[PDB]
Design a binder for this molecule. Sequence first.
Ligand code: LMT
Ligand code: LMT
Lengths: 25, 25, 25, 25, 25, 25, 25, 25
Amino acid sequence: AXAEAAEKAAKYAAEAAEKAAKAXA
Amino acid sequence: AXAEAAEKAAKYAAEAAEKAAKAXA
Amino acid sequence: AXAEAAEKAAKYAAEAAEKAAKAXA
Amino acid sequence: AXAEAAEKAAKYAAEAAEKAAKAXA
Amino acid sequence: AXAEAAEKAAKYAAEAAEKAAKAXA
Amino acid sequence: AXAEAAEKAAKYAAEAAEKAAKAXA
Amino acid sequence: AXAEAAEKAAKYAAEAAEKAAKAXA
Amino acid sequence: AXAEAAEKAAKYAAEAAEKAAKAXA
Ligand SMILES: CCCCCCCCCCCCO[C@@H]1O[C@H](CO)[C@@H](O[C@H]2O[C@H](CO)[C@@H](O)[C@H](O)[C@H]2O)[C@H](O)[C@H]1O
Ligand SMILES: CCCCCCCCCCCCO[C@@H]1O[C@H](CO)[C@@H](O[C@H]2O[C@H](CO)[C@@H](O)[C@H](O)[C@H]2O)[C@H](O)[C@H]1O
């Protein structure tokens, strides 16, 4: 359960960062 | 470069959490 | 959409923090 | 106090994000 | 500079977890 | 176990950030 | 101590935002 | 405006944290 929650958190962050990266591309 | 670094780090963390979730199962 | 995703993330975090706070209550 | 502060911080972030999501309509 | 700041945050998190671990010991 | 796992993960993150700080220099 | 740590994080955030704002100026 | 708004919010957060640090002392 803790691992799954961490994964969800990390995926949220990765998606947010990807949006920013695309805006700078 | 900031956004790319965040994205890479976050993806790594997501993969590590996913692997832990699978191992814990 | 970015604000909506942030709201969902923050609610998830709040739910997890509240469960931890209730365990300590 | 740590868990209660975390819960308050997450709730503040959720309220801030919700207000932004409504404004951005 | 970003790596230095990230390192301090991670060290902070490590010490916070250590304090909890010691209380649980 | 939850505190110990968090401590271990944070130390790993700290080491990774340190390595990046050194590499960037 | 937690307030002090939070203050350092907030100051870091402020300076990072200032960096971006100056570049956009 | 986005960077400027983030800078203002972070400064507000830093001031709030500083006040808490001084009060806790
Ligand atoms: C309310 C929480 C708000 C957290 C906000 C985000 C993080 C802010 C970090 C502020 C600066 C932290 O400053 C950092 O503190 C940690 C914990 O004492 C110290 O780290 C200390 O513990 C770590 C972990 O065992 C050791 O690896 C290290 O050798 C030791 O000095 C760092 O040397 C210091 O640079
Ligand atoms: C890759 C990003 C990772 C971020 C991780 C989470 C935050 C970690 C914070 C680590 C410690 C930061 O250390 C903090 O740095 C900021 C930015 O230079 C400094 O703050 C500086 O800018 C602020 C904002 O204008 C001024 O109010 C302050 O007078 C000035 O000193 C703080 O005096 C220092 O205590």
